[PDB]
Amino acid sequence: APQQINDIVHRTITPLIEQQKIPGMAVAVIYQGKPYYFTWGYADIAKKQPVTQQTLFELGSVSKTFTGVLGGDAIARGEIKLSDPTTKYWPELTAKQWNGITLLHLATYTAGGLPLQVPDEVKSSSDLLRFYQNWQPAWAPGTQRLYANSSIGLFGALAVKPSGLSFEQAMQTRVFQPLKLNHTWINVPPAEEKNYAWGYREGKAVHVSPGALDAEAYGVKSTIEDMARWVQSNLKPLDINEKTLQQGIQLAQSRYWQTGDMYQGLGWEMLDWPVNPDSIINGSDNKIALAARPVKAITPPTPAVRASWVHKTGATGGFGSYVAFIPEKELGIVMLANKNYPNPARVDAAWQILNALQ
Ligand SMILES: CC(=O)Nc1ccsc1C(=O)O
Ligand SMILES: CC(=O)Nc1ccsc1C(=O)O
Ligand SMILES: CC(=O)Nc1ccsc1C(=O)O
C-alpha cells in the first residue's frame, strides 16, 4: 500500500486497538476505487489463530445493509413495492393496528414503535404471529423512528415472499453470488469454520445465538475482502451487470426520512457530505442511535445522492463493525473487530482515516 495510506491507517488503528483492548481487527480502505487491507491480533485467542484477510467476522447490524439491498432488488424486479400494506404479504396479520403500516415503514423503523428485539420468548412461527398481532403501536405510522430488529427483520422476511425463495436462498442467489461474495454467509458452512473468528464479551469467547429474524436483522458473517467488495459495489452501482441489483443498491441509498442531520435509507443511513464529524461520531452513540425520534417524511424520497457519507454501525455480543463510504470521492472503509467496543470510537477512527485521504 502507498505509505500515506499505511501511515494514516496505522496511526489511527494502533491506539484504538490499545484503548479498547480489541483482540483482533481487520480494516480495508477503498481509495480511488482500489482496496487496501490491514490486519491485527487474534481471531481465536485460545488457539493462537491470527486475524487474516480470510477471517470471518459477525457483521451484526451491518447485515441490515444486505437486507436493504435485497429488498431494493425485489422492488426492482416488481415483486414488491414499499407502498404495499404489510398485510399484502402476511394476510394473517388481521389486527386493526396494521392498517396503514407499509413495507416502507417496516424497512425504515417507522411503523410506530416496534421493539429493538423480538422477545426471546418467541420460539415458533405461531409465537411470532401472536407477537405482531398483539403488538400495540405507541405512534401513528411514519411519525417516529425507533431502530428495531423486529421492524427491518420483518421487512426482509416479507420482501422475499413473492420470489418463493427462502431469505438465505434469495440473498445468496440475488446478492452474494452476482457480486462474487463467496466468503459471505448467513450460516457458516463446515468448510469455512476454520476461518470463523470467536467474538469476545467480558473475556469470554462467544458466537451469536439463534433468534427469530436473525438472518434478516443481524445474521451475516463476512471477510474483510468480501466487505471491501461490498463497499466497491455500493460506491459504483452502475458497474453492476445485473440490472435489478444495480437498481436495488440505488434504492437502498435513497433518502426516505430525516431525523436531525441523518437520512434513513434501506439498511444504509446517510448524511450530506462534507459532514460535521461531531454529528456522525456523537450520533453513532446508542444514546441517540437507539432513541425514539420524530421523523420528517421525504416526499417523495431523494434518489441516492453521490455527495453523501453513507454508513452503518453493527454489533453482536462479541463483535463490532463499521462501514462508511463517500460515492463522490470513491472513498470507503470497513472496520471489523471481534469485540463490541463503543460506536463513537469506531466512527471517530473512520473519520480521521477518510478525512486524511479526501
Ligand atoms: C421466523 C423465524 O425467524 N424463526 C422463528 C420464529 C419464532 S422463533 C424463530 C427462530 O428462528 O428461532
Ligand atoms: C410463493 C410465496 O411464498 N408467496 C407468498 C407467500 C406470502 S405472500 C406471497 C406472494 O407471492 O404474494
Ligand atoms: C444484534 C443486535 O441486536 N445489535 C444491536 C442492538 C442494539 S445496537 C446493535 C448493533 O448491531 O449495532
UniProtKB/Swiss-Prot annotation:
Binding-site positions, a beta-lactam: S61, Q117, Y147, N149, A315, N340
Expression induction or repression: Can be induced by beta-lactams. Expression is not up-regulated by the non-beta-lactam inhibitor, benzo(b)thiophene-2-boronic acid (BZBTH2B).
Single GO term (MF): beta-lactamase activity
Chief place of localization: periplasm
Subunit (UniProt): Monomer.
InterPro entries: Bact_CellWall_Synth/Modif, Beta-lactam-related, Beta-lactam/transpept-like, Beta-lactam_class-C_AS
Substrates-to-products reaction catalysed: a beta-lactam + H2O = a substituted beta-amino acid
One cellular component term from this protein's GO annotations in UniProt: outer membrane-bounded periplasmic space
Residues the record marks as active site: S61 (acyl-ester intermediate)
Function: Class C beta-lactamase which confers resistance to penicillins and cephalosporins. Has benzylpenicillin- and cephaloridine-hydrolyzing activity. Has weak cefuroxime, cefotaxime, cefoxitin and oxacillin-hydrolyzing activities.
Protein name: Beta-lactamase
GO biological process: antibiotic catabolic process; response to antibiotic
Location(s) in or outside the cell: Periplasm
Miscellaneous note of the record: The class C beta-lactamase family has a specific amino-acid numbering system known as SANC, for structural alignment-based numbering of class C beta-lactamases, or else the simpler name structural position. A multiple sequence alignment was used to derive a consensus sequence and then the consensus was numbered taking into account insertions and deletions. This allows use of identical numbers, e.g. for active site residues, despite differences in protein length.
EC number, UniProt record: 3.5.2.6
Known regulation of activity: Inhibited by the beta-lactamase-blocking agents avibactam, enmetazobactam, relebactam, nacubactam, vaborbactam, taniborbactam, zidebactam, and beta-lactam-analog boronic acids, via a covalent binding to Ser-61. Inhibited by non-beta-lactam, benzo(b)thiophene-2-boronic acid (BZBTH2B) and various cyclic boronates. Not inhibited by clavulanic acid. Inhibited by O-aryloxycarbonyl hydroxamates, via cross-linking of the active site Ser-61 to Lys-312. Weakly inhibited by citric acid.
Effect of mutating V295E: Increases activity about 100-fold with respect to cefotaxime. Reduces activity about 5-fold with respect to cephalothin. Reduces thermodynamic stability
UniProt keyword Hydrolase present: yes
EC class (word): hydrolase
Alphabetic keyword roster: Antibiotic resistance, Hydrolase, Periplasm, Signal
